[PDB]
Every structure is written in C-alpha cells, then in structure tokens.
C-alpha cells in the first residue's frame, strides 16, 4: 500500500530567468532526482529503473527531457496570454504520480498549484480547474485541452504507465522497502521542568513512544513531528510536562516493529 | 535553419510525377503543412500531417510523415501547368495557439506545358 | 476564417511612417505578423493575444505592433527602411495551431 509521487517545482522570477527541479518519492523513500543543471534523469537508488529495459527507460526520460523545455516556454507564453492580470514572481508545483492498493488495483493523479494554490489537475481525459480556482485561469485549461497530443500521452502516462512503472519497482525495491532500522533512546529535561523521550534512526515511520510511571501511562504525553534523518531514517521526541522533583519512577517505552517484542525502556 | 526542403529549384514536363523533400530539427514536432504559393500570391494549405507515421492525400497530392526519421515527402502525381509555384514546408511545435510555425524556404516548381 | 490586409501594395520613401494593417472578423484572441524574403520562409516579427497585447516575434526590430481591438492588428514602421522591403503576411487563429494567414502585402522601400 505505497504512494509514488513525482514532484515538480517551477519558478519563474521574470520573462527571462526561469527554473525547474524534480523529486521522485516511493512512500518515504527518494527514488529519483531532476536537477535543472542535469539533462538526465538521476537514479538515488539502484533499483529507479524499476522493471523497465533501458530502451524504455531512454524513451520515457525523452518525453521528460521534452516536456521541461516545453513546459518552460509554455508557461512564459501563459504568462503573456494573461498580462497584465498575472505577472512574475510565478511558483508552479506538480504532484504526479499514483496510489497503489492490493491486486491489480491503482488510482493515479495529477494536481498542479499555482502560487502554492492547488488550483487545476488532469482528469479523464482533460484538464480542469478544481472548485476555488480563480476564473481567469479557464483560458489557459481551453489551450492546453486543444493539444490532443498531449491529453493522449498524459492519459497513457497515468493510467499506463504509472501504474505499471511502480508495480514493478515495488519488486526491484522490494528489500530497501521492507528493511528495518532500530531506534535508540535517550533522555534529558529542559526548564520552564520538561522531560523529552529523543527517539531517533528507525524504520519504517509508524512507531509507539509514551512516557510511563511503571505500568501506567502518561496522559499528558505530547508527541511532535516525524523528522527525518539524513540516512533515510526517522527522529521523534515526546514531551511531558512535569512538576520539579517528580522525575524520579518516570521511564520513557518505545515500541517500533524492528526491537521485536523487546520494547525499549529507559529509566530515569 | 530547422527546416530544410529538398529541392531548391525544379523543371518538370506536364504529365509528370515529382517528389519534394522536407527535413528538419524542430524539437517537438506536432505536425507538418504543406502550402503552396502562386507568384507573389497567398499561402494555400494542402494538407497536414498529425501522426507519428503519417500518410495524406488531396487530389493529385499525397504526403507521408515520418517523425523518427523528421521527414516529409510531397508527392504531386500528373502535373499541370497550374503547379507552377513555391512549396512551403511548415512545421508547428505544439498542438494549439503555444505554438511557433518553422517555415521552409520552399522548393520553386517550374512545369512545362 | 478569412484574414484581410491593407494596403495590399506599398511604395514608401526612407524614413516615413509606414502602417500595415490587417483585419479578422472571426473573434480570433490571438493574431500575428511575418514577413517573406527570398532565400528564407516566414519569420516572425510580432504577435498578440488581445486587444492591449503586442509581444515581439523572432525579428522585431525596426517594428512595432498596435492591437486596439480584437479585430484589428497593425505593424507599424516609424523609421521606414530599404532593408524593410518584403512580403508581409498577417495571421490570426484561436486555441488551436491552425493560423489562418492573409493574402500579403508587397512594400517597397526607396531612398
């Protein structure tokens, strides 16, 4: 049950200076990279090919080579279509890609923002606005809708192409996808006093961590964000707030799917 | 140039069949016209190839369209003397109005009546 | 789709203002100018999405475009030349690739 998503980011500072940098994610896991100083694809794993024989992979890498120098012209042209109501700075992201489920079962996206506004997204077999786009914006989907070359391409591209590409990478990546980094622990308290549970270097993300008094939990346990590591790996802390003095019979449990039954305890 | 046409100057007898070349760079290619042009008069569209492997006909007039290969062939069958004119080989970079036309210099087609 | 251009033909003087102009009465957003020189096919010179808009082409110097109305797009020569002479052909078109092109108009620029 993964989520592959390729994400676009495009910026347009003026007529002029303009550019485009893409990230290929699998779950949580980076498997491509565009910088816009490379003229290729880069693979971050060794299994990015998926599935797919290097005359696939060649001919699908064109297409993109293709599209980010059209793309980058077309938006330039938008532009000019549409002054003096729109105007540079321009920040366009893209979400691509598709969900997958058990079995043959798939359902793929395209969503496009404009100035960090989820504002247009292919569907069926055309591009359209989403409920809160600006009207004006209906002008630019009626040019892009008569470019019947590019509707048949993007059309096979998410209900083709993605669904097969990741079907196959799940394969090829079967054993980063699947790998299991274990946590480690440890304590400290910050004045206000604040206990902290640092849990850091584990995989994958779901993970339990609760401050305890022996058999009890804590209620007043809060959570923070999942961060990430460097090594492909994740970092949580959990604060609790405590009365000075009462530190003493508090322990720190965390649960994560690579101790196996063995349960960290950390004792203060 | 992006686009390039084979020949540059053509004699031909009435009757005749002749065949004119066009080839070209233009990244991307969304398809190909072909006009023909009077002495100092407009610009009459024969026929437009769309397909990755294209094939069109009008007339006396067939096209082919190769877009591997980035190559054109306009084929005029039984020539009159009305043929004598400029062809113009155009080609569109995108599928709407985002799109810039490339035009050929043309092949000039002198038929002898 | 027809696409009218005037003057059809025209004999200037170095210097001299010369307007070409050309209309389109098929609700047409976007309209454009090329010129024709033996030796080259059409190239770009300038174009427009609307009234209000002029965007240069591939070759714009020495030109300047007016759109006043969606009907009605002119090329404008303020300082007219002899290297100005040429074909003009004048284009119109909507979303689609399809431009539909004018007839031409032959200028002659003398010293």
């Known amino acids: 049950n993964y989520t592959f998503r390729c994400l676009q980011m495009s910026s347009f500072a003026n007529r002029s200076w303009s550019r485009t940098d893409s990230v290929v994610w699998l779950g949580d896991l980076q498997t491509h990279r565009w910088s816009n100083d490379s003229a290729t694809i880069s693979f971050t794993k060794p299994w990015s090919q998926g599935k797919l024989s290097n005359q696939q992979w060649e001919k699908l890498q064109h297409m993109f080579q293709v599209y980010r120098v059209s793309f980058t012209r077309d938006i330039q042209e938008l532009v000019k279509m549409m002054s003096p109501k729109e105007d540079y700075p321009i920040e366009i992201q893209l979400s691509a890609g598709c969900e997958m489920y058990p079995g043959n079962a798939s359902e793929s996206f395209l969503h496009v923002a404009f100035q960090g506004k989820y504002v247009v997204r292919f569907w069926g077999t055309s591009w359209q606005t989403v409920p809160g786009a600006p009207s004006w914006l209906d002008l630019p989907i009626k040019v892009l809708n008569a470019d019947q070359g590019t509707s048949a391409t993007v059309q096979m591209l998410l209900n083709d192409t993605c669904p097969l590409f990741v079907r196959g990478l799940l394969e090829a990546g079967k054993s980063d996808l699947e790998k299991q980094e274990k946590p480690v622990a440890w304590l400290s308290s910050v004045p206000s006093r604040q206990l902290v549970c640092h849990v850091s270097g584990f995989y994958p993300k779901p993970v339990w961590v609760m401050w305890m008094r022996g058999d009890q939990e804590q209620q007043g346990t809060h959570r923070g964000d999942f961060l990430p590591n460097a090594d492909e790996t994740w970092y949580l802390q959990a604060t609790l707030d405590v009365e000075a003095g009462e530190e003493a019979g508090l322990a720190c449990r965390v649960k994560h799917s690579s101790l196996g039954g063995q349960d960290i305890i950390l004792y203060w | 140039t992006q686009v390039e046409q084979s020949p540059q100057s053509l004699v031909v007898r009435q009757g005749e069949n002749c065949v004119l070349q066009?080839?070209?760079?233009?990244?991307?290619?969304?398809?190909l016209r072909w006009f023909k042009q009077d002495t100092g008069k407009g610009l009459v569209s024969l026929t437009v190839?769309?397909?990755?492997?294209d094939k069109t006909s009008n007339g006396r007039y067939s096209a082919t369209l190769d877009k591997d290969a980035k190559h054109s062939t306009l084929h005029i069958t039984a020539t009159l003397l009305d043929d004598t004119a400029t062809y113009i080989c155009?080609?569109?970079?995108?599928?709407?109005?985002?799109?810039?036309?490339?035009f050929g210099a043309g092949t000039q087609l002198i038929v002898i009546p | 789709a027809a696409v009218t251009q005037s003057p059809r033909n025209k004999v200037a003087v170095t210097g001299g203002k010369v307007t070409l102009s050309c209309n389109q009465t098929?609700?047409?957003?976007?309209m454009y100018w090329y010129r024709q020189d033996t030796g080259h096919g059409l190239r770009l010179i300038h174009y427009?999405?609307?009234?209000?808009?002029?965007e240069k082409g591939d070759i714009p110097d020495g030109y300047k475009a007016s759109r006043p109305s969606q009907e009605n797009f002119s090329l404008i020569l303020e300082l007219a030349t002899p290297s100005q002479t040429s074909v003009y052909f004048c284009?119109?078109?909507?979303?689609?690739?399809?431009?539909?092109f004018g007839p031409g108009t032959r200028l002659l620029v003398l010293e």
């Open positions: 190839l769309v397909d990755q492997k």
């Open positions: 155009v080609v569109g970079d995108r599928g709407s109005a985002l799109g810039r036309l490339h």
């Open positions: 284009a119109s078109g909507d979303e689609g690739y399809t431009q539909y």
């Open positions: 098929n609700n047409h957003n976007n």
């Open positions: 427009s999405y609307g009234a209000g808009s002029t």
């Open positions: 066009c080839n070209y760079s233009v990244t991307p290619d969304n398809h």
